[PDB]
Amino acid sequence: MDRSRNPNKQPVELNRTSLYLGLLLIFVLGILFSSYFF
Amino acid sequence: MEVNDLGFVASILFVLVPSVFLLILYIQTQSREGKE
C-alpha cells in the first residue's frame, strides 16, 4: 500500500578485458553461423 | 545467386543484440570509477 527502498540490488562489474572475450565470442559465432542462415 | 531471404535479418541480430548487451555492461562498469 506504501512504497519503500530496496536493501538489495548489487550492481554489475563487467571488466574491460572481459568485454573483449564476449565481443570476440559473438563474432566467431557470427562468422560461423551466418553461412548456415543463408 | 540464391539466398535464404532472411539470414541478413538473422545474422545481424545474432551479432548485434548480444554485443550491445555486452557493450551496455562495460560502459555500466567503467563509468563507476571516475570520481563524480
Binding site: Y20, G30, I31, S34 | G7, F8
Partner: peptide, 29 residues
C-alpha cells in the same frame, strides 16, 4: 547477400586490433 561475412569478419578482425592497443595494463600490487 555476400557482404554479411565481410561485415562480421572485419569486426572480428577489428577486435583483434583493439585488444592489442587498448588492453588493461596489469599493475603489480
Amino acid at each position: 547477400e555476400s557482404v554479411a561475412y565481410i561485415l562480421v569478419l572485419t569486426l572480428a578482425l577489428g577486435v583483434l586490433f583493439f585488444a592489442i592497443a587498448f588492453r588493461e595494463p596489469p599493475r603489480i600490487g
